Design a protein around this nucleic acid. Structure first.
Ligand SMILES: [Mg+2]
Ligand SMILES: [Mg+2]
Ligand code: NA
Ligand code: NA
Length: 331
DNA sequence: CCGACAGCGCATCAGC
DNA sequence: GCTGATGCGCC
DNA sequence: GTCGG
């Protein structure tokens, strides 16, 4: 659907880099998103932008980005970004955030103390928390993409073991995988059980038993966090004799009350872009959709009680939208 | 001018 | 000990 | 940084 990156790639890459620096170094998440918003609308623009004034016309592009675009079109670069790039502190802070568990604050703290590389993190493992040690251990693997064929083999294992623990569980792999992508960044598993509804006692065991079974068959190899409702960890496909091991992958497993299950599958199937569009439409029709429920909006905009949801389609029905196949949810 | 830009689970920090 | 805040990862 | 009350 998108135009050739050749059209405005130089601009979109510049904005994305600026975004990353705002997020990781300046700690300005809203400027990070402003740049991502501008990058996205420009990426969708089917013409080669010839000036900042032309870009200014697009929603999300304001005076400052228009000015940056003119500098980029005139010189092929941005002095501010060139300087940021060669700044040892900013570069180092930005790089460390690539480690799962190391966000802007820890990255800054580390660099402030002279810890700037993966080698430095290794020599100072006692300054890292559990999550960070794991992100460091699998730095490379966590950045690799997961081909869909491996996602299918991973799902076979998850579905097989979940039913083995209790045939009444319901599990659904969501994310880009469910939207049919040829590769995914991780695996997100949503599970529910007939015995677990919003008005049911907190049952951490329903999640735990599934996690333990996946650890028993050696599928789950590490744990980043694990509560009564959400597990975040690492998994790996069994190796094919003589063949090289598969890289370790990020997997999340969420236990959701049955009456909130389908809103969850909807939310975690995404994409974020499609979800925003769906939430916007819902509001227009007098409804508000979040991760757990869909609720009617009263005269003054106050959300009422959660509506009954027994499938993803029920949600689309409520908002008078034709059911969108997951593969059609990129936007 | 200036507030919104989503908000929550889990791990860990700050402080009583 | 515990409560509440913060960092981080997430559609 | 951008939008909009
Ligand atoms: Mg049975
Ligand atoms: Mg996901
Ligand atoms: Na604009
Ligand atoms: Na990180």
């Amino acid at each position: 659907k998108a135009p050739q990156e050749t059209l405005n790639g130089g601009i979109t890459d510049m904005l994305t880099e600026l975004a990353n620096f705002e997020k990781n170094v300046s700690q300005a998440i809203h400027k990070y998103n402003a740049y991502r918003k501008a990058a996205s609308v420009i990426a969708k623009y089917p013409h080669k932008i010839k000036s900042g004034a032309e870009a200014k016309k697009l929603p999300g592009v304001g005076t400052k980005i228009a000015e940056k675009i003119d500098e980029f079109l005139a010189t092929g670069k941005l002095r501010k970004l060139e300087k940021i790039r060669q700044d040892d502190t900013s570069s180092s802070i930005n790089f460390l955030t690539r480690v799962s568990g190391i966000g802007p604050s820890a990255a800054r703290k580390f660099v402030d103390e002279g810890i700037k590389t993966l080698e430095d993190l290794r020599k100072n493992e006692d300054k890292l928390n559990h999550h960070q040690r794991i992100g460091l251990k699998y730095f490379g693997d966590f950045e690799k993409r997961i081909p869909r064929e491996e996602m299918l083999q991973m799902q076979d294992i998850v579905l097989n073991e979940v039913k083995k623990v209790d045939s009444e569980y319901i599990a659904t792999v969501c994310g880009s995988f469910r939207r049919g992508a040829e590769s995914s960044g991780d695996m997100d598993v949503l599970l529910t059980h007939p015995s677990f509804t919003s008005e049911s006692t907190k049952q951490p065991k329903l999640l735990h038993q599934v996690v333990e079974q996946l650890q028993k068959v050696h599928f789950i190899t590490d744990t980043l966090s694990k509560g009564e409702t959400k597990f975040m960890g690492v998994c790996q496909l069994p190796s094919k004799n003589d063949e090289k091991e598969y890289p370790h992958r990020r997997i999340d497993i969420r236990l959701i009350p049955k009456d909130q299950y389908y809103c969850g599958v909807l939310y975690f199937t995404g994409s974020d872009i499609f979800n925003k569009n769906m939430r916007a439409h819902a509001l227009e029709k007098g409804f508000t959709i979040n991760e757990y429920t869909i609720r009617p909006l009263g005269v003054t905009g106050v959300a009422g009680e959660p509506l009954p949801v027994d499938s993803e389609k029920d949600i689309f029905d409520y908002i008078q939208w034709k059911y969108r196949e997951p593969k059609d949810r990129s936007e």
